[model samples]
Target: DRLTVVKQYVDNVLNKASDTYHGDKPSPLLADGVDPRTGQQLEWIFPDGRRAVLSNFSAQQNLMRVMSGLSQLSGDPRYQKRAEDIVRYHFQNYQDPSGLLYWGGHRFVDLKTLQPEGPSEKERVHELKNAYPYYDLMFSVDSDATARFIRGFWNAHVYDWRILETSRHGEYGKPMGALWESKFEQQPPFFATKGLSFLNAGNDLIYSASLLYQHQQDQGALTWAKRLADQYVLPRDAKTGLGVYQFTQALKREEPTDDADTHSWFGDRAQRQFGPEFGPAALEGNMMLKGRTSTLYSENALMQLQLGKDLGPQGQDLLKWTVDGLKAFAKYAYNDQDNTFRPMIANGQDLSNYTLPRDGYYGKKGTVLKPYKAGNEFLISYARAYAIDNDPLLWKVARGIANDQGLGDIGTAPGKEVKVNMDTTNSDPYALFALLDLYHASQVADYRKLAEKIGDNIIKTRYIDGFFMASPDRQYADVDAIEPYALLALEASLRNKPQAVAPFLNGAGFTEGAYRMDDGSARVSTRDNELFLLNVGEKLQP
Candidate 1:
């Protein structure tokens, strides 16, 4: 059964995913991946074969759920204990005296020497993208550190509250100014700053602060959350009222700062590539909406909804604010007839009418484009939210995705064999996740059957030698293994009836995206999914 399969995943992980597995100074922060062949630690192989070992907990968010689930399930305390040890270690060990983690976008903990490393010369710069972190577990492990972190996170990001100016990046351990949380004002439209307040990163900031409000009743944290949120809404289109992907523009410069930045939203590249005739507002970004319909798993609004739920009564206004944005985008950007989402400027401008001039950010100069597909992540995110709020707008978007993918057409006579690929961009596991989510939201018994049908097949096909493979032919560690959580979530729903599919296996790291290798994404995915299945019941029959 998948439970035993999952348990084997956990054991194999400790046997190899651990830093000391091969006799090194042990670290609870597991390696990104090991050689699928020999269980040897995976390395970032240079052209000359020079290698680097890494531990990117940022990407291990999916693993957190598995850790949480297994700890609750199996009698063994080691899985959750290891994860708690990880949180406690980061709290006590890694930090810039300022409290910003040396974790997110800018750096990784090098497994080779237990040192922080990054592509940049100064590796401690802070950056995050839909890093759906496990704050509750952090609180469970070290309450004081979790609270201090919420304050510190907001403390480091803002440069000026007068315009709500902020950066997507933060300096590690840099002394931060006081959070002007008490100060509040509506800023002018898209006020100028080099701060690239990408919504995904901003999502994490809001998450930390909101959770602080939930746990500690810190009004400042909530205030800061609203303040930063205001920056994005200020630049929204007056006609459609849809929000921009970000809040500020990077200055081109007359004698540029060391950081001569622009709105990092492909705007700078669009400006440099297409030039003026493309539109006057291109420099400030109104072109592409950050591939909204792409399967970018971590998103701003959906996560905002989840955080809102976490805060309960206090999050009502924020919840409605985000809901309004979703409604606007759906009504204005989503094209129901075509079953695809428009890749327009966030402020409600069409991109379908335009073509690129050269091979730059927008893509090949003459390449004609199509609307973005409402892929698995897109559907599941909306479906998960619908389980919470059951809004009509969310259903339209999500239902469109399900219909397009033929999720409604799934059949039974389930195979104990799996065939479809489980790699990043497209995975059968996520497709099943969307179907299962729809089951919960609609209470459609059919959706659940389809999910169970697919789960049975994948369990037989992918679980080989005690691990989930990228595909039957491809066996490697990519956090893709976190399929166990979705599977366990399916099982959790089976036990508890359709509920929000267990918490997001959120949090991701620098390496391992649609195109990158596992920097231990699979390690945690393996450990926790197994544990969650155990929690859901080790002997629960498939």
Candidate 2:
């Protein structure tokens, strides 16, 4: 029933927009029908009348996981065959011979010329975050493809000494050794996008690189991973001994200033976005720049944990320091009065409105502001930390999040807002995940009850216009939103009470393994067909 609903939604919304790339070469690059940059519909169609295309790397990864999972679950070779096809197409069409570029470095190509149209340097561009991991997930199903996927990335970015620090390589490009160059510089045609190797970006790279290192037993991969990790650890402040948590910072420099904004390569806009006080020197409180927050679970903290497990003792040392930095941020950013954590921190010491305004980005004296996405992940990280070391403080932090969010009394009301934004995309599901982690640790009934409440609330209140909207207020649905997290929460809720699935899960008017079409006549002869077969449920029954 669950698979059916998910599959129909994927077909209607996701697959409906699909397109197969047939550019200079026959490529299987799936794309969305709409060009996000122009808000105009793109022109492409599948051979079997399907209209879907590559939405993003993350979507591809999710599709791969879903397809592979269905194959394993239903004992179907067709699903596996479809999964192999997607993987094969991606590698054959997208991979560069030198193994460095994926998604063509996100460069615009002229269909007429069959070449990248801009001055984008191929060598400086690599999919450290997206393709690397998409390919990594592919590793679980096929090791050879995984090896080639990672090898291409290594050859393009890591195998060479380009990522090595000047102290080691005698160069000036401070790209955090992740093969990223200054992406913030204005590029024509392509929309204005801030592209820097922020801590989160580097963190993601380290995670994939670490995983690849473990898989291949490559010492060079380990060394590259270490370099990225070293780059993330900013120098400690002398007075408070706290490290500033920056959303964005330089990988290179002409002269070093405590402030990341003051670097020679950085533009004026960057200085404005990240105030002058944003720094090389740590502040009284952990500081994050405007418009961004530190993601402890998805981007930063979890990556370190995984890396530590892979690297052994040396990795353990890095993990310890990373945790210490995280703990320092939590110490000051957490509000005991409200039982909430701040999304980002700023020092009240810098009083000037010119740089450090009392705006939410700049923390006021002695107050933690409304918890954002980071706060959600922070709770999860603490829960995870407790699982590792059995620390009471970590457990307390996680519980404090539950208290502050009103998850304690969730079952009491239908419309109770347990999240700051009431958005299931980031908050609701994350809160449930964190609570579930806590529940597993302590066997606390409140945590389990709260998680179940979130799942129920998600179905009852979150479903809008035949889909899960971004939030209660935001009526639009995001392509990347809902399903995965909803599925995760639902799966967890049903683990101990599979019989309860019919009642608790019925509110959405969707059933697991339900289908929009049964004849298979409308089904496109692609992975969508295989997914639909698995989703329809009846075909799998003996």
Candidate 3:
């Protein structure tokens, strides 16, 4: 029954997407969503009515699961072909000179124009907002390009490798001004400098490079990943080993500055939160990028680390920093009573007792003084990591939180509906994911039972009208935000074929950005061979 519904979904969306593709042409890339009523590509309209028909390749990670799963179940090669074609076409045609793809948070490929597009369109800035690339798929198809893009990604983002300081936005063609060929040169004090590091961006960098080395035996990839992963580690307090949210400090503004956007919008969150002296030197949560929740220290990085750890001893060097960060948070911040961590500060003593900003990103006006807390992100990371290695504390932390969240014996909301925003509803996906890991670790049949129950909830709640809804109120064929269709595919695969699901469950729906290659040769991409699926599962291949 699950397979039936998902098959129809892939069939409809693929056909509708093809029809809307550049005068009825075939395209592996499609807008993240389509108008369910008309089956037309959805447009993101700017205030000036400057609408763009965009397709985020990063957004399509889950959709690839559906297509590839359908291909396996029905023995129809079409879905597999299309899924693989996306990677091949992008690799051959959509590359900047630096080798980054025309994908990710701030960039998208315009379906209508067949050109690169994004919020910072044309100039092609890179932003990795929950943008987890499909590494398992990329390596399956084009191994060389897969290795190339991973290196290019680091070169494009890490502005000052000397200090390993990074920024969220990448200047499309200007990263490093040349290729990243060798191991990074390390200076005396590695984590001394304050730089902007993002969990979302940093996670993909570490995870991709880890997989490149683990799968292809690429020594360069592993070396780069370990250094990148260590960005969090080298800065922490010697005794506590606790971590900071943003590695860099925000400079205090001296008021006035001709009303630049950073002043108005950035709001000097760090400065307002901790007064001038404390703020300028204090570590921060990334307050600027619109990736609100995940911009913090380790949510994205932890889960990606779990994925890489499943690859074995080969990737452990890459995995070490996150494990250290996790243990440090557990020691200093994790509260077993509530199974929550207070929004942490890295250097520990000096940064403690500070309030969230009075009127900025953390609490909006600071008067909402409860301060944000960490819950499931830590639990899922712990649970998934515990599955790979039997760490009792990891199991303890995971179970405590799981029970507190009604995923243990507290029981899920039997009467609950599947609302992506609602508590038990949206979390059903991760609940099942965590429970499965718990089952793997302890072999408790109850974990499997509960996971199956949550899976049922996902099916009941998300499988609306004919497709998954972008909202509970509205529906679209979204590849990014809404659906847990990947879980459904994983569930189906687990029943018979046993496909490995991503620890992050929805399989990291991320696309990245690249500059364009010359499509001027009157030659079209023969996306034929790239269309065959060898590997698309989220975990390390056996």
Candidate 4:
């Protein structure tokens, strides 16, 4: 009975999402009790009968991923059919008059608003608030819409010359100039200047398209994709070898002003090109143009390191770069004694008199707070690098962390979810990725065990009876938990323990649907893929 209830609830969410996307003429996801004003499609209303869309692409992709996962779990085509419908409907709405994609969807509010007319400028400026219709469409299996979306991004928006992140706003033709000058702050923050992440996003699209073309023997699609790859992702950052965060047109002639490190905004140059581990010294004016000169480098090296193969050519390059960057980070940023990475650095760019302390690894400019603190955070990175180059030291670090049950004499917690010592949900994507790498490298059965444990815990404690609550910050047990629960499922499979993860699979419904937020700490809602599915299984007052 419990299992049936969970299945039925899961079916209900998918069903509603299906109804929201079932038309030839694309319609809003708002009609099915979803708010057009916000992207949220809550199962229940608030005090004033309002809800907010608590997600972006991570949510969308997760939804699609869930369909794929559900199919695997149930061997049912209905799950897949629902996934296909969502993708198709959304992709159809991605094009412009010329039939090209811009990036992904944007903040749509009006149920009656047509394509490209609803989202305002303010929403576009906020990161994770909107989508680049073109980028998201490329991930879809629908070829025609993909083609249209792609063309739209290139033909209409490329020349628009505005220095914005993307254009679901349909003002792609506007001469906005280079992006460095713009204040766009959405995910893939570097969309304005052809940022590296954007390039990576583009890379995924092209590579996928290439595979599709190869399968169909469609020379046109293949050729088009190849050309775009050559013109954009492949050729643009060739020299830099280091992935870029942006390709701003406004900064075409100037360098981006150094933004503060504490700011975790998406397109901030410091965050994109070099995470907290690497300093901004190497990246500056004209350095970006250098990307066009480098022919090969690691693109998804970390993922490659974990997944066991290079999805792109730059696997090793990225691996080495990441390791070396972390090494520098360890020496210059981290004070293992202090337990945090130095968030700021000086490029000799002269910002006041801030400088790295003589005995300290960090510069005076950075705050003393721990930026990336998993109890064994550094070791995790080391393990990933080891997987790629077979570095014994990296492996040693990983093994140690996996075994570290104590906080090493300090007040600390062990395990992935125990990292911060709170149940606050993290993306956990990195941890899952690392566990996979360690699994492939070592003969230790424990790695797989740990992976399974990780998945199980996430599903068990995070999911109520069945509904997987999102991050440990949200208050209500609502629909948002679905994606995070799905992530729990995905990780279970990647680690080769899908069957062991059945408890989570069979029970991701409302029983797990209760949560409360108080003080500064909110109840953790599931944040799978990136979308925040709220709790729908809240207790009824009747």
Candidate 1 residue lDDT tens string, 1-542: 65555566777776677776335567677776654556755454322334557577776767766766765555567878887988888888775577766677656676777777653443347776667677878888888888877677777777666666666677666565667434656666655566766666677777778788778788877777767766666677777767666666665445323222322443355455545555546643445454533312236666666767776797676677666666676777788776777766654667764666556556666766667766666766766766766676777777676656655422221121222222212336777777776665666676777677667766777666556675544434644256777677777677773342346534455542111223422121122122123221132121
lDDT of 1: 0.62
Tens digits of per-residue lDDT, candidate 2, 452-494, equal 6666666556554444443444422433333434454446354
| Alpha-carbon TM-score of each model against the true structure | 0.81, 0.62, 0.77, 0.54
Clashes of 2: 22
Question: Candidate 4, which segments miss by more than 4 Å at Cα?
Answer: 1-9, 15-58, 98-105, 109-119, 122-141, 154-339, 344-371, 374-384, 396-433, 471-473, 476-542
lDDT of 4: 0.36
Say which candidate scores most in lDDT.
Answer: 1
Error of 3 at 154 (Å): 2.2
Query: Which tens-of-lDDT digit does each residue in 1-118 have in candidate 3?
Result: 6566667777777666652545656566767766555675655433334456667677777676666666766678887888789889899888777778877766677777777765
Model 4 vs. true fold: TM: 0.54
